[PDB]
Subunit: 333 residues, 4 copies
Amino acid sequence: SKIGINGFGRIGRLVLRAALSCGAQVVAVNDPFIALEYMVYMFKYDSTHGVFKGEVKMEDGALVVDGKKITVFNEMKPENIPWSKAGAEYIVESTGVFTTIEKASAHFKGGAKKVVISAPSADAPMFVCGVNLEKYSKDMTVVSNASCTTNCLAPVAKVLHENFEIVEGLMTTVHAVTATQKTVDGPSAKDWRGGRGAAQNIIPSSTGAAKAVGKVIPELDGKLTGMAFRVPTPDVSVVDLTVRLGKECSYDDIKAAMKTASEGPLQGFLGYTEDDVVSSDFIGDNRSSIFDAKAGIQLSKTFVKVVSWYDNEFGYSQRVIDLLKHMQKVDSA
Amino acid sequence: SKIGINGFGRIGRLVLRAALSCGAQVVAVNDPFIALEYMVYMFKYDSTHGVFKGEVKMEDGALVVDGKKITVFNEMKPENIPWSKAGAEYIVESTGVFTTIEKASAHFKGGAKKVVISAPSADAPMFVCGVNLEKYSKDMTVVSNASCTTNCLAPVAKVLHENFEIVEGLMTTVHAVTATQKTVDGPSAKDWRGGRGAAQNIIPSSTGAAKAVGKVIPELDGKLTGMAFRVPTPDVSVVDLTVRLGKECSYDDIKAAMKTASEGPLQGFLGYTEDDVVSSDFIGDNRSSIFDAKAGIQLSKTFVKVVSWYDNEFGYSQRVIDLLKHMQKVDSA
Amino acid sequence: SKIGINGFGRIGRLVLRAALSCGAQVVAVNDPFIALEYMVYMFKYDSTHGVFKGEVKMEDGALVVDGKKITVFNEMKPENIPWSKAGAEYIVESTGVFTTIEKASAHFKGGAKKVVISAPSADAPMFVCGVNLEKYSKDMTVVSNASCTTNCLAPVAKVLHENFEIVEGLMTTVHAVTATQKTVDGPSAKDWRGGRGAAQNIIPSSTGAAKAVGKVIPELDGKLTGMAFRVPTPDVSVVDLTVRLGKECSYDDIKAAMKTASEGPLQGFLGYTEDDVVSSDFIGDNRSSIFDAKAGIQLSKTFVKVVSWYDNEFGYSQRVIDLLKHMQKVDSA
Amino acid sequence: SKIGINGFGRIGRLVLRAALSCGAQVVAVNDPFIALEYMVYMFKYDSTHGVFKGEVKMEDGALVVDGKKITVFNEMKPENIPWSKAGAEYIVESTGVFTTIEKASAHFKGGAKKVVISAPSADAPMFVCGVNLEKYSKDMTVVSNASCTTNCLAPVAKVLHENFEIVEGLMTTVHAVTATQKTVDGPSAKDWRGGRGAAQNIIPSSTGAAKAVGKVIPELDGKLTGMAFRVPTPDVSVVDLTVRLGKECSYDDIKAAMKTASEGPLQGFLGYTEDDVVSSDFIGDNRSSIFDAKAGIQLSKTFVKVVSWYDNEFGYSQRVIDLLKHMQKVDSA
């Protein structure tokens, strides 16, 4: 294993924090606007997932978590980050700014070599664990792993459709506060309705069902669209999908299906429940999207609605490491 | 005008304070577990809509609000509440415990006569402002006015449908906490997942869109269903409805259809905006349902989603007041 | 060991939950208002501390947790609960209604034997770990363990005082919502300003600075008093304590005083942090009170302010376990 | 009357909307990072305060509110702002950046003349309404007007002291969120424990009790100091003062010192109540500081604790208004 974490906040850290609990190589970190000694404190403590326990302290000028020397670097320009002097071959791009094959590639200049963009990209392919896989192979150097939501409907589409089809469909995500969403009104000079007070409000949000779904499981590319509400909730989020379906079924079969798949092949990615209630239970639930056989579920013959919940902050976080992995296997020879 | 408001917490209250921004008659209130000096203090102040101005004091042993003595009484059972010695014509039920003609009816015994249920009834007619109207005449003694969510969907159904037909559809209301929602887990002995931490979580919710709607705008009795989530938000609540239409059209006209309404006949009930953002603004917006033309709206050819926000606590408040009135011109002759 | 936990809400549970991370003996549980089957569900799930892993299910008509048969009973009257056919000698009392020697003693009639009140009581002893101990011996049958604030302030008192003496103090507790605190106003028929909306508001609250502290640590019994603020927070709580000191010293020795103590004697019960920030970290932190060296601290000669945070839900829960324990050692022989 | 408001967010704004409720002059705004038509929308609508009714529109390239052409401008450095072509006599400084005599004088260069610091300064005088007054006269061109908390303490200390004296005192401010306080952990490079997540947590806050009170009411420059907790709460706030008195007296006369002051001199600045509870009622209460008489107030013969709330957003908003007014009486001749 060998990895690298360009920048580090929400994704940046759990991705790291994830690497660790999994079997991922410690690395190099590189985050301007955060000094070596804030990261220790800044990754050791977590409002929502919280604290940690490793040997989390600095030493010979860098971060040593759990007794393992992970260089940390800084530079407001990646064509500059070392990985030559450094020697971490797989880089993860966190930042937010550096989303396109053009903006990533830039890694190398410095000295570097293979990349994964932790967000949705306009040119870069767009892996999602279920289906990612095959579509994926070694030609690929700057792969991109489509978001949290996409990762939540991905699974859930695949089941639904292939198995009953999906002819047309809509989706509501009930997002739970994000980095952006301001503490109390203000600018979103671009994002305007989320310039507003993030804690008193139910606030719409343009999103992407369109996005990876079409872009990942292409038989679709054109049948799903969808929206989002951002709510006080600190970390969960329930994706709301309604389908005109195709193969008349019984809400029931919706059940069985997702179950048969929770174990069969979506094994670790889709989960399935009926042991109800839940709510932002999932907080810390390394998973991908879980099916709630019974809650917010409802049928009308071939017109159905399902609920799937994520953990936005870290189901995804585990995935980057799984995307991250999978490739090594293939990539490595 | 003579009123009566059996009980008073959320509806009981704002329906009190409703009455007086109108041209309503004061009365008699009758809330067990609540003494006269609690009420004044308990009406003067509202965390959500709050404070007031009225001459808010006890006098010659009853409530005097805005220098206009309105009795108040207490008894755990309405077949005993005065209205005899009282002289309070139309009586409104808030409590919750007394929902059906069987249970309202009982009013009389004490000495009574004219009544409306602030909630869904089993047997009771079920007027909604827009449509309620002509279906309703004086045969009806104990008529009910189905709820908050419903009140927000009538309007929007009736435009949509009548106008593009609606063949099948689905709905998500994002409720904002209620009376019920435990402040930190606990029994819901009957209502289990909203027993849970109503301020950490998004919690599913059986609801009634087929409810009032079907049993209000008959032609549908059967094509709509839906569910709910209670989110932190102290007072708002966006109704999400998806429809397979009937008459192909373009989310556009969904636009003008709702606009012509807001003005034409759906005057003061349905509202419509295009000046976006909005959020939990609506707080204190005597209205009923507001189409949000552009927000959490999406089209796909004859498959669509519309978004309208309520005000659970008092858009409905003004309605009882109008169901309440309407009743009088007709009823009184 | 052999226990019994009469009832189970916030305390009954984490008290259960408690026994088990220790080496406490499971038992019998006895809660009107809750079926067997809802317990399992109500015990393994938790907004704030959540999920568990236990062999969490029922069997030959009881609760088996982690393959260990704990009987469950329900009766609205404890002089009625088995402890007889039951064989469980130390009962714990969570309810809330049964706070006095008079009220507890009760137990026995049915058949039973030895008890602790996880509440503050009129007449029963009032043990708190740090100090409690010695003043405690086998005479006491229905001894009680004064609350969490107290649990919070004993150590922090005892350290300051014995050590720089303490001539007069005041205290503010920033409490973090409770069972009571209605989700949207309402009755508080005896408790009024915590009948109001407790997710919108900073709502004061009478409290027991005086309570258990005088009553626990004698020499004070007249020098401390306080108040509380309930804030949105789901679970932590910070005691703010001002003292006119006695022995001049410097904010500093306040520091070593507590640190030297974190290790010395208040060992597991007092904490001490200089590694700042913290905030409602402590979430799930089996402890007692932790002193935050530098945060919410301030000096001026011998007039000072100190800050310790709790975990009202579950530092306290460990303690009942400890109180519950020690007794055994004394009591048993 | 002529005003001018450099920048405009939380204060900038309500000082606009404050002026207006007044008899202030409209003006010209000047807020880089915000377009003419976002202003209008951003002036119009408020999560906490909200909406308006004004003739809120853009016209001949400026904002006309309430049919009053108030010019707007944009550039990232006021030594450049017009006020010469322009003609708005008194400039008010909001932004944040530009807090010193040095920093505002800067204004001039462009063309301008008179100024106020809606913020604490290091070199600019510090006027609070109660005491600012006389200390103030015309040799002062770029005057400063201490902040929220201060404004809340000023009156309360002023009565207490003068009147019972104040020897040693400490304070707790229970602030409610801020422009800054990140909604999900994160940077606070300068201010770290507030970089942490503002919505989950109770979070310390350095403050200045020391600040303007010392530098306001001369006589104390040295007897007080304090801290702050931010909580969820969107907008209200309560200053917690504990004091070693000097003149003995008893909780009570604390009452009437404060009550006779509301009427007498602190007339419309300190307000005082006993019809208790309140809470984050205050929301929009043009005022300054209100003494809650009986709420988390406690004596012990010359050691007390008085509680007073503010409305940080806009009690201070009206103040700028009259610091501003007053200046004009004098300033003009």
